[PDB]
Amino acid sequence: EVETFAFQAEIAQLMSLIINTFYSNKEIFLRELISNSSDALDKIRYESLTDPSKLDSGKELHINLIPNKQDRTLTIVDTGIGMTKADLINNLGTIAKSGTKAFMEALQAGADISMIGQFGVGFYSAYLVAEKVTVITKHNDDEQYAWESSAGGSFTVRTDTGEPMGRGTKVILHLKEDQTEYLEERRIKEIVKKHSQFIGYPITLFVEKE
Ligand SMILES: CSc1nc(N)nc(-c2c(Cl)cc3c4c(cccc24)COC3)n1
Ligand SMILES: [Mg+2]
């Protein structure tokens, strides 16, 4: 069963701004997704201090970067807190706790897209480089779900089976044809060193088999 939802208007407008604004410094998407992963890891780390059983789904707190040139995807995986179905719909489909409104106003008053992470919406910078984003997530309190959107004002949510994660979130970027530089090992290493060198969890960049 696949459920289809409309983004809240302001989120659809934010997405359109990211997709349509001329902006060359696209590499910042990776820092933004790694920052979200680090925050999700801080959350499970903290919750586990008072409830160690929350790590029964995996004790290791880490981030993996997985390029795949055959599929033209870059995947950012973490073992963070993850999202229940409701968290997934609220966090990715609505303004919720984000600074969506403040960011859109800021862009009209001198700010630029690289500042997106100051407004709680850095995830949407994935649309600088991806034509489609799939988010697979597993929270201790729920089953595994897959969210997906190619923008255009809608997204889908369905249960995900056959490839269970212990806990965390996987952001799969289906790259635009002209954005394949983000699959190259030297490019990913350069961006991690420039923007994510102080993250407090291991970031492992996978090597390609062929
Ligand atoms: C809550 S667990 C989590 N893990 C990771 N890696 N990312 C997110 C996350 C995603 Cl996937 C997307 C959005 C988020 C927002 C806030 C906080 C976390 C997230 C709002 O923009 C969408 N949440
Ligand atoms: Mg802020």
UniProtKB/Swiss-Prot annotation:
Region (Interaction with NR3C1): 1-210
Full-protein interval shown: 16 to 225 of 732
Similarity annotation: Belongs to the heat shock protein 90 family.
Residues forming coiled coils: none
Protein name: Heat shock protein HSP 90-alpha
Taxonomic path: Eukaryota, Metazoa, Chordata, Craniata, Vertebrata
Function: Molecular chaperone that promotes the maturation, structural maintenance and proper regulation of specific target proteins involved for instance in cell cycle control and signal transduction. Undergoes a functional cycle that is linked to its ATPase activity which is essential for its chaperone activity. This cycle probably induces conformational changes in the client proteins, thereby causing their activation. Interacts dynamically with various co-chaperones that modulate its substrate recognition, ATPase cycle and chaperone function. (Microbial infection) Seems to interfere with N.meningitidis NadA-mediated invasion of human cells. Decreasing HSP90 levels increases adhesion and entry of E.coli expressing NadA into human Chang cells; increasing its levels leads to decreased adhesion and invasion.
Entry comment, domain topic: The TPR repeat-binding motif mediates interaction with TPR repeat-containing proteins like the co-chaperone STUB1.
Taxonomic source organism: Homo sapiens
Domain of life: Eukaryota
Modified residues (N6-acetyllysine): K43, K69
Post-translational modification: ISGylated.
